[PDB]
Amino acid sequence: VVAAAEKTGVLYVGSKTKEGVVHGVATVAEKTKEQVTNVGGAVVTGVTAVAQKTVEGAGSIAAATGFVK
Amino acid sequence: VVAAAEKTGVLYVGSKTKEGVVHGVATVAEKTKEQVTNVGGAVVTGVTAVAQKTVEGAGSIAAATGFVK
Amino acid sequence: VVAAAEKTGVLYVGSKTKEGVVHGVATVAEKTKEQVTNVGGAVVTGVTAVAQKTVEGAGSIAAATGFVK
Amino acid sequence: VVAAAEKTGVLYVGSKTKEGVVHGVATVAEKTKEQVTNVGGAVVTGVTAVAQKTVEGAGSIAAATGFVK
Amino acid sequence: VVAAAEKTGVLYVGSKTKEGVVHGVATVAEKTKEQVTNVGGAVVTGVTAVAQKTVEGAGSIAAATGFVK
Amino acid sequence: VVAAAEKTGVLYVGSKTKEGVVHGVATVAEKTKEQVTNVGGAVVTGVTAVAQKTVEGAGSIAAATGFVK
Amino acid sequence: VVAAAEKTGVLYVGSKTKEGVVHGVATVAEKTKEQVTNVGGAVVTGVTAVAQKTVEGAGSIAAATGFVK
Amino acid sequence: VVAAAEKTGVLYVGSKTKEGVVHGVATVAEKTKEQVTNVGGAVVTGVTAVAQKTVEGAGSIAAATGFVK
Amino acid sequence: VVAAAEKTGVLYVGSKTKEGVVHGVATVAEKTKEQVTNVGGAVVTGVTAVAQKTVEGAGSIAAATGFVK
Amino acid sequence: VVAAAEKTGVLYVGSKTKEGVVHGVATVAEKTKEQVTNVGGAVVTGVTAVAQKTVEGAGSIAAATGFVK
Amino acid sequence: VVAAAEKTGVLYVGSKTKEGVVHGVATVAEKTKEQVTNVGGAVVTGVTAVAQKTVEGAGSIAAATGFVK
Amino acid sequence: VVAAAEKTGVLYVGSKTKEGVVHGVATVAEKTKEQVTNVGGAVVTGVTAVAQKTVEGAGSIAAATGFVK
Ligand SMILES: Cc1ccc(OCC(=O)Nc2cc(-c3ccc(F)cc3)no2)cc1C
Ligand SMILES: Cc1ccc(OCC(=O)Nc2cc(-c3ccc(F)cc3)no2)cc1C
Ligand SMILES: Cc1ccc(OCC(=O)Nc2cc(-c3ccc(F)cc3)no2)cc1C
Ligand SMILES: Cc1ccc(OCC(=O)Nc2cc(-c3ccc(F)cc3)no2)cc1C
Ligand SMILES: Cc1ccc(OCC(=O)Nc2cc(-c3ccc(F)cc3)no2)cc1C
Ligand SMILES: Cc1ccc(OCC(=O)Nc2cc(-c3ccc(F)cc3)no2)cc1C
Ligand SMILES: Cc1ccc(OCC(=O)Nc2cc(-c3ccc(F)cc3)no2)cc1C
Ligand SMILES: Cc1ccc(OCC(=O)Nc2cc(-c3ccc(F)cc3)no2)cc1C
Ligand SMILES: Cc1ccc(OCC(=O)Nc2cc(-c3ccc(F)cc3)no2)cc1C
Ligand SMILES: Cc1ccc(OCC(=O)Nc2cc(-c3ccc(F)cc3)no2)cc1C
Ligand SMILES: Cc1ccc(OCC(=O)Nc2cc(-c3ccc(F)cc3)no2)cc1C
Ligand SMILES: Cc1ccc(OCC(=O)Nc2cc(-c3ccc(F)cc3)no2)cc1C
Fold this sequence. Notes:
The structure is a homododecamer.
Chain A: E1 4-7, E2 10-13, E3 18-30, E4 36-39, E5 42-44, E6 47-55, E7 60-61, E8 64-65
The complex binds the ligand Cc1ccc(OCC(=O)Nc2cc(-c3ccc(F)cc3)no2)cc1C (12 copies).
Protein name (chains A, B, C, D, E, F, G, H, I, J, K, L): Alpha-synuclein
Sequence repeats (chains A, B, C, D, E, F, G, H, I, J, K, L): 15-29, 30-40
Family (chains A, B, C, D, E, F, G, H, I, J, K, L): Belongs to the synuclein family.
């Protein structure tokens, strides 16, 4: 991601890059009711506006896994 | 992703790139009712506006897995 | 991510980069009711506006895992 | 991430970079009711506006894990 | 992250970098009610506007872990 | 993170860097009620505007761990 | 609009009424361009989510009238 | 709008009424461009989430009127 | 708007009323550009989340009127 | 707006009333640009979260009027 | 607005009333640019979170009027 | 606005009233730029969190008026 310019008037040079970006989010909630009952497991809920960038690794978002033996 | 320009008037050079981007989201909820009952498992719910970029890895979003033996 | 310019008028050179960024978020909640009952497990909820960048590692967001033996 | 310029008029050279950044967040809550009952487990809730950058390590945000034997 | 300039008019050279930064956050709460009952476990809640940068280590934010044997 | 300049008019050279910074936070609370009852465990709550940078070590923010045997 | 109940089990009596109410509206706009040129007249535009109740009077919403002589 | 109850079990009596109410509105705008040129007239624009109740009077919302002679 | 109750178990009596109320509004704007040029007239713009109740009078919201002679 | 109760168990009597009330509003703005040029007129803009109750009078919100002769 | 109660158990009697009230408002602004040029007129802008109650009088909020002769 | 109670257990009698009240406001601003140029007129800007109650009089908030002859 480089940007070079030479001159020998308006000159514009740009190089933009986005990875894993969340923006411009508007949320309205009213009288939302939730009830979770877990017995020896895994429950994931209520995930909003989450951004993640992972390099040379495993990336999990809102991941629920049962018991491992 | 490069951008070069030479001059010897308006000159514009650009190079944009997006990967895993969420934007411009509007959500309205009213009187939403939920009920989760889990016994030794995995439950995933309520995932909204999630962006992820993964390199050299396994990326999981809202992934639920049972017990592993 | 470099930016070079030479001159021998307005000259602009830029190089922007974003990874794992959340912005421009507006949230309104009213009378939200929640109830969590966990017995020997894992529960994750209420995750909002979370950004993470991980290099040479495993990145987990809102990840719930059962008991490991 | 470098920035070089030579001159021999307005000249601008820039090189910006963001990783794991949260900004521009407005949150309003009214009469929110919560109730958590945990017996030998792990519960995570109420995570908002969290940014993290990890190098050569495992980064977890709002991660709940059951008992490990 | 370097910045060099040579001259032989306005000349600007900059090199900015951000990692794990939270800013521009406004939060309003009214009559929020919470109740936590824990018996031999781990509960995490009420995390807001948290930034962390970790090098050569494992970084955990709002992480709850059960008993380890 | 260096910054060099040579001259032989306004010349500006800068090199800024931020890691783990929280700023521009405004919080208003009214009649918030909390109640925590813990019996041999760990409870973490009410964490706001926390920044940490760790080098060659494990950094935990708002981390609750059960009893270790 | 009355509600009466007598008792000598769950008993519910209600009487709800709505007049001129707008709710549950989500709007997303992107790159909208407008241009208005008025010379001695009246122009009305961009009216959204407007509610009005008028008693013993004339109610006008987004009403444009030319010059009156 | 009255509510009466007599007792000699759960008993509920209610009487709700709404007039001119706007709620549950989420709006997202991006790069909206506007341009207004008025010469001796009236221009109205950008009206959103407006509620009004008028008794014994004339109620106007986003009303533009030309010159009156 | 009255509420009476007599007793000789849970008894609830209520009487609620709303007039001209705006609530639960979330707005996100990004790079909005505006330009107004007025010469001897009236321009109204950028009206959001406005509530008004008027008794025995004329109520105007975002009303633009030309010159009156 | 009265509330009476007699007793000879939980008894609740209430009488609530709202007129011209704005609440639960979250607004986020980024890089908004405005430009107003007025020559002998009236310009109104940038009105947000305004509530007014008027009795025996004329109530105007964000009202622009030209010159009166 | 009265409240009476007689007794001869929990008894609750209340009578609440609101007129012209603004609350629960969170606003975030970033890099907003404005420019006003007025020549013998009236300009009003930047009005936020304003409440007014007027009895036996004319109440104006963010009202701009041209020259009166 | 009266409150009476007689007794011959918890008894509660209340009578609350609000007029022109602003509360629970959180505002964050960053790099806001303004520029006002006025020549024989009136400019009003930057009004926030203003409450006023007027009896037997005309109440104006953020009102700009041109020259009066
Ligand atoms: C998340 C994100 C991604 C990409 C972004 O990039 C948008 C952008 O660069 N917009 C632009 C350019 C100009 C302009 C004005 C005058 C000129 F002479 C030349 C250019 N004005 O706005 C931004 C964000 C915030
Ligand atoms: C996420 C994302 C992706 C791509 C984006 O790119 C849009 C863009 O660049 N739009 C533009 C260009 C001009 C312009 C017009 C005439 C000129 F002379 C100079 C500039 N105005 O707006 C943005 C985002 C935010
Ligand atoms: C998160 C993020 C990503 C990208 C961003 O980049 C946007 C940007 O650079 N916008 C711009 C350029 C000009 C301009 C116009 C004419 C000139 F002559 C000189 C400069 N005005 O605004 C910002 C953010 C905050
Ligand atoms: C988090 C974050 C990311 C990126 C950011 O970058 C935005 C930026 O640099 N905006 C800009 C440029 C100019 C300008 C004016 C006159 C000139 F001649 C040349 C440039 N004005 O605003 C900021 C933040 C806060
Ligand atoms: C967190 C963060 C990240 C990046 C930031 O960078 C923004 C910035 O540099 N903005 C700018 C440039 C000028 C300017 C215009 C014309 C000139 F001739 C000289 C300077 N004015 O504002 C800031 C923060 C606070
Ligand atoms: C704008 C508007 C109009 C009408 C509305 O009225 C809906 C409503 O009253 N829903 C309801 C009743 C019950 C219930 C639960 C248990 C019981 F024993 C008896 C009743 N639960 O939700 C609301 C709005 C917000
Ligand atoms: C997600 C995404 C993908 C692609 C996008 O690209 C759209 C775009 O670039 N639109 C444009 C160009 C111009 C223009 C004006 C004057 C000129 F002289 C030359 C060009 N105006 O708007 C944006 C997004 C946000
Ligand atoms: C604007 C507006 C209009 C009408 C509204 O009325 C809704 C309402 O009253 N809902 C309700 C009733 C019960 C309940 C259930 C069982 C019981 F035993 C006792 C009470 N739970 O929620 C609200 C608004 C905010
Ligand atoms: C703007 C506005 C309008 C109307 C509103 O009215 C809603 C309301 O009253 N909800 C309710 C009732 C009960 C309940 C619980 C236990 C019981 F035994 C009996 C009743 N819980 O919530 C509120 C607002 C904020
Ligand atoms: C603006 C506004 C309007 C109306 C409002 O009224 C809401 C309300 O009264 N809610 C409620 C009742 C109970 C309750 C439940 C069981 C009991 F036994 C006793 C009381 N809990 O919450 C509030 C506002 C802030
Ligand atoms: C602006 C505004 C308007 C109205 C408001 O009124 C709300 C209210 O009164 N809420 C309530 C009642 C009880 C309760 C608890 C135990 C009991 F036995 C009986 C009642 N707890 O909270 C407040 C504001 C701040
Ligand atoms: C601005 C404003 C308006 C109205 C307000 O009124 C709220 C209120 O009165 N709340 C309440 C009642 C009880 C309670 C519960 C059980 C008991 F036995 C005795 C008292 N706890 O909180 C406040 C403000 C600050």
